[PDB]
Ligand binder design. Structure first.
Ligand SMILES: NC(=O)c1ccc[n+]([C@@H]2O[C@H](COP(=O)([O-])OP(=O)(O)OC[C@H]3O[C@@H](n4cnc5c(N)ncnc54)[C@H](O)[C@@H]3O)[C@@H](O)[C@H]2O)c1
Ligand SMILES: NC(=O)c1ccc[n+]([C@@H]2O[C@H](COP(=O)([O-])OP(=O)(O)OC[C@H]3O[C@@H](n4cnc5c(N)ncnc54)[C@H](O)[C@@H]3O)[C@@H](O)[C@H]2O)c1
Lengths: 342, 344
């Protein structure tokens, strides 16, 4: 029943996709003398059940609770984890387990990376974003005095367990958040993602349907191909304007909403440049709006956004699933593209 | 004229050992858009020469002075470095350089390993200990609330530059501190090291002579060969009791003087166990003491020492010169006895 995607890295590691993955989690960490589970506030009950079940197999399983969301990622939360790993006596051969969204995976991933020079971690992402993006591929990031995610270590996890059952509690808004990243994968590597969504957009958003599991298999396949690959740049499709919008709105905008405007922008850029056909360009706008994602932003915001973007690089499409670059485009071309969008 | 020891790891890097290595640094880093040189207070004039010659090559070169010694390794110093990297605009393809003793290489190592997911770093160690131990291997450590060196990343450097000219200003007491690691390497892997020291122990301690550069090369070879391969444990020979003595002394003992007592303890422990010949056992104390290192500790400290070592004991022991083995969960009475052989 459970599908797996191997990431072809040294050593290779699996992303496992299915429903109720406790058995698989047991198989992996049964031999570990100790295990700590870093979870967001809302998942304490799911944490306890991992701990109970691990404790059951003769394992000193512990659990640690971090602040939700972006606060679970500040440097003092990392300090906090460190101390606790200290008191528990977590050693070189033991393991961490992350339970939550991208923020939980980042911070736990960072702590694992920097504890005794790196200890095993299994990610159990529980947002769609965390599932298709944050948990896959070994980049970690934390929030420090320096900014957001400038600090972070590179550390691949032992495995990633993508348990579709966990999505049943996830709200519409966060589901739509992460779909923006999924659409991005559709345009840059796998157009079947696009056809699956197109066929019924509301069914794409239902965690209980046939469509979502396949969307996640595919978006994760795309990300695993990239990280086993500089091409890692393609995953920034839509993030140049995206991130600027996120900044300008002081992080109130859901990441995915900002990426969504970015994609529609990137598409207009490549269209005006004669690199992308009108039909594929227009398809950005129609897929994203129909999922409830934003396709426009304040038409007066461009000057402030150009300032934040501090020459510029964009990922553009040179045709469906053929990403290229545009480096230092003319400001007036950025103006014109912005108009068309906004 | 420089010697290169290759560290055969992936990706592999060289350790280059010679005199005046500024040209080698330039070859390495000339093509980088930005370099930041993280250095201890006393090396500021040397930091500036580096920064200067790198700027003459179009590199946007910066220098960052950290607090000296352990204070330089504290979490806050880390937050500061990150801040400066952010301010300077150090990117994914840029590079750090570390200049100083093992404390500089660690803190600057941790910083490179945790900046934008790991960027290039070149180590310029300027103590014996830093040259032979700290700079080689990719382990970094920093001091936090959790204790010393529990927190750290694993990150290989681009290269290691071991410039003997820098040892000219190093005091005897630091030099002797580093030599305990050199001696450790002799006992576990390369006996020629011991032969060279015993031939004239004072020649061994002179940065001007011809002996020290060979001891440095061989000690680094030993460590490179171990890291390129649960063998890593032999590098802790003498560190099991030694680390406890250090920690009991709230770190007012030098690391080398603690390791020296630990080597003599492990020698005696393997001797009483029948694993090590009397002559090789006693050779520990003779080489260490001839170099000016302590050879015993406080006769009443064992119980506290065991309580620090707890926080089943394992020891690296020698089954013969350069044949390291293990002792797992020794009889408590065997430890009482080895220690009393060491301490009166
Ligand atoms: N390292 C990387 O490669 C990478 C990639 C992309 C994003 N990220 C990071 O991910 C973070 C954002 O990720 P996110 O969108 O998951 O944010 P998040 O982890 O902040 O989660 C959003 C919210 O959903 C809640 N939640 C999580 N799982 C739930 C569930 N199953 N049911 C109900 N609610 C649930 C959380 O408590 C949180 O309030 C950002 O900090 C970003 O930098 C990292
Ligand atoms: N990462 C590792 O594998 C590893 C291995 C061994 C030691 N270490 C770390 O190394 C640190 C100790 O290293 P250390 O002994 O170099 O201590 P250190 O870096 O504190 O330096 C000792 C002193 O010598 C001064 N000094 C440095 N170079 C000099 C020179 N060329 N001339 C004159 N003075 C000089 C320094 O400013 C400092 O006061 C410890 O923090 C230890 O944990 C790390």
């Amino acid at each position: 029943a459970p599908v797996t995607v191997q990431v072809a890295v040294d050593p290779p590691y699996p992303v496992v996709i299915g429903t109720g993955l406790l058995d698989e989690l047991e198989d992996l960490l049964a031999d570990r003398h100790k295990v700590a589970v870093v979870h967001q506030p809302g998942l304490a009950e799911t944490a306890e059940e991992i701990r109970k079940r691990l404790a059951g197999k003769g394992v000193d399983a512990h659990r640690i609770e971090i602040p939700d969301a972006e606060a679970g990622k500040d440097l003092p939360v990392v300090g906090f984890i460190w101390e606790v790993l200290g008191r528990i006596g977590i050693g070189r051969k033991d393991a961490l387990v992350s339970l939550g969204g991208g923020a939980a995976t980042d911070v736990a991933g960072f702590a694992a990376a920097t504890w005794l020079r790196g200890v095993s971690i299994v990610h159990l992402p529980t947002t769609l974003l965390g599932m298709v993006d944050a948990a896959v591929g070994g980049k970690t990031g934390i929030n420090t005095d320096a900014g957001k995610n400038l600090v972070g270590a590179f550390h691949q996890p032992l495995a990633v367990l993508v348990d579709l059952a966990t999505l049943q509690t996830l709200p519409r808004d966060e589901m739509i958040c992460g779909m923006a990243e999924v659409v991005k994968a559709g345009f840059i590597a796998d157009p079947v993602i696009l056809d699956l969504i197109e066929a019924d957009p509301q069914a794409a958003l239902d965690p209980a349907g046939d469509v979502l599991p396949e969307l996640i298999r595919r978006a994760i396949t795309v990300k695993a191909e990239v990280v086993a690959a500089e091409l890692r740049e393609i995953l920034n499709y839509g993030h140049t304007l995206g991130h600027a919008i996120e900044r300008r709105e002081r992080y109130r905008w859901r990441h995915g909403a900002a990426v969504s405007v970015g994609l529609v922008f990137a598409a207009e850029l490549a269209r005006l440049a004669g690199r992308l056909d009108d039909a594929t360009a227009q398809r950005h706008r129609t897929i994203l709006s129909s999922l409830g994602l934003p396709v426009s932003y304040d038409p007066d915001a461009l000057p402030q956004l150009l300032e934040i973007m501090a020459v510029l690089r964009f990922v553009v499409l040179d045709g469906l699933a053929k990403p290229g670059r545009m480096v230092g485009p003319d400001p007036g071309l950025l103006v014109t593209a912005y108009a068309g969008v906004c």
